Every structure is written in C-alpha cells, then in structure tokens.
Amino acid sequence: MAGQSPVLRIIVENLFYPVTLDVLHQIFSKFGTVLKIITFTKNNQFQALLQYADPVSAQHAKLSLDGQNIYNACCTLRIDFSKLTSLNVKYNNDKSRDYTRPDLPSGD
C-alpha cells in the first residue's frame, strides 16, 4: 500500500514560448533531485514527466508548482502524480532525459 512513488507529470497549456528539458529539469531539480525526465506531445499537447528521489519532494513540489507559470503569466504547467507510478525512461536522446544513468542508448 505504501506506494511511495515520486513521479510527477507536467502539462503545459496555452502554447507561447518554446520550452525544453534543460528547463523542466532545472525546475523540478530545485524541490528535489530529478532521477529522470521525459517530454512529448499528445495530439498537440506538451507534456513532460519526471521522477523524484523522494515522495516528500514530489508532494511539496507539486503544490509548489501546481498551476504556476514558467516565465511570468503564460505556459501554465500542470503537475500530477503519474498513472503507472513511474515513467518509461530507457533511452537518452531528446524526447527523454535520464539523470541517473548516462550509459543509456539514444533510442536506436
């Protein structure tokens, strides 16, 4: 029952400025260490997931950035606990980014 799974999923709303991982990382990397990260677009829906090192950093972080901005008053980012209690990160290229093991492939 003790899920204890630090995995938050960010969701940008209202396309405005071009974002990236280096940004989302340095962001969540403040409230806690970011083991891994991922980004994608579901039918034109920017979404970047990540995994913390401890649920404590994920709980506070979530609310610490829940419905907040990335610049001033645009690019609304929505954070929420993953569904699979984890993210699929086994490749290092551009769509994904693992800050735990750099000895991973680039997809192919």
Curated annotation (Swiss-Prot):
Shown residues in whole-protein numbering: 177 to 284 of 557
Function: Plays a role in pre-mRNA splicing and in the regulation of alternative splicing events. Activates exon skipping of its own pre-mRNA during muscle cell differentiation. Binds to the polypyrimidine tract of introns. May promote RNA looping when bound to two separate polypyrimidine tracts in the same pre-mRNA. May promote the binding of U2 snRNP to pre-mRNA. Cooperates with RAVER1 to modulate switching between mutually exclusive exons during maturation of the TPM1 pre-mRNA. Represses the splicing of MAPT/Tau exon 10.
Official protein name in the record: Polypyrimidine tract-binding protein 1
Domain of life: Eukaryota
Domain RRM: 8-84
Subunit structure and binding partners: Monomer. Part of a ternary complex containing KHSRP, PTBP1, PTBP2 and HNRPH1. Interacts with RAVER1 and SFPQ. Interacts with IVNS1ABP (via BACK domain); the interaction is direct.
Species name: Homo sapiens (Human)
Subcellular location: Nucleus
Covalent cross-link site, Glycyl lysine isopeptide (Lys-Gly) (interchain with G-Cter in SUMO2): 42
